[PDB]
């Protein structure tokens, strides 16, 4: 009925990384640790990084999906709002009401779960190119935070969960996210209320 949000390393040591990209004005996706949030533009690209202490198994994949954070709404579908799944902005692959695409990977694959009715987006975990340390998913989010009819200004989650073939829970992380025009400003802005708080 409600996916886990509980953070699990598991086995391999599974967790995420977000770059450091500040808070200026023209900024188009910033992270704040001390909110766990994501602040980002509608269908920008958010660099999303996956750590490991060992090397999972091959065919592990890695799939994001997107709950409402407050417990009242935690069993309502996060779906894009009646405009924008009704924009013929597609890429060809992702299904026009799943909030969160992947962007540039040919192996993604989109999941509306014929039980829970949830969306999802699962690509093959792959190891990091040589010199690089981590690897990294590119996610776009469709919809902004305040679509009327959609999410309509209640904040989201995104679950992070690593899988094995079988569809299994290796590890999971998670974020909340708030796409909107001014990310900078508005990490920002909550940032001082933490603080203030
Ligand atoms: C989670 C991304 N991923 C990593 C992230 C960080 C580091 C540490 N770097 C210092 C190693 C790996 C790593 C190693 C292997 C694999 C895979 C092998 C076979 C697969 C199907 S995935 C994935 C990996
Ligand atoms: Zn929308």
Same mark, same amino acid.
């Given at each position: ?6 953070? @699990? ?8 990384? +977000?770059?450091?990209?500040?808070? !200026? ?17 509608? !269908? ?10 060992? #090397? ?10 997107? $709950? ?6 935690? #069993? ?23 909030? $969160? ?6 192996? !993604?694959?989109?999941?509306? =779960? ?24 590119? @996610?776009? @989010? ?17 679950? $992070?969960?690593?899988? =094995? ?9 998670? +974020?909340?996210?708030?796409?909107? !025009? ?16």
């Amino acid at each position: 009925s409600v996916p886990s949000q509980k953070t @699990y390393q598991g086995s391999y040591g599974f967790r995420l990384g +977000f770059l450091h990209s500040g808070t !200026a004005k023209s900024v188009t996706c910033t992270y704040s640790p001390a909110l766990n949030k994501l602040f980002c533009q509608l !269908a920008k690209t958010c660099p999303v990084q996956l750590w490991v202490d060992s #090397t999972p198994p091959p065919g592990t994949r890695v799939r994001a999906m997107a $709950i409402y954070k407050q417990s009242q709404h935690m #069993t309502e579908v996060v779906r894009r709002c009646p405009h924008h799944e009704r924009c013929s902005d597609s890429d060809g692959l992702a299904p026009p009401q799943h909030l $969160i695409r992947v962007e540039g990977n040919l192996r !993604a694959e989109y999941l509306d =779960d014929r039980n829970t009715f949830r969306h999802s987006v699962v690509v093959p975990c792959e190891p990091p190119e040589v010199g690089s340390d981590c690897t990294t998913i590119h @996610y776009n @989010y469709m919809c902004y935070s305040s679509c009327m009819g959609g999410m309509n200004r209640r904040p989201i989650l995104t679950i $992070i969960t690593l899988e =094995d073939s079988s569809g299994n829970l290796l590890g999971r992380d998670s +974020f909340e996210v708030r796409v909107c !025009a001014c990310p900078g400003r508005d990490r920002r802005t909550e940032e001082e209320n933490l603080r203030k708080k």
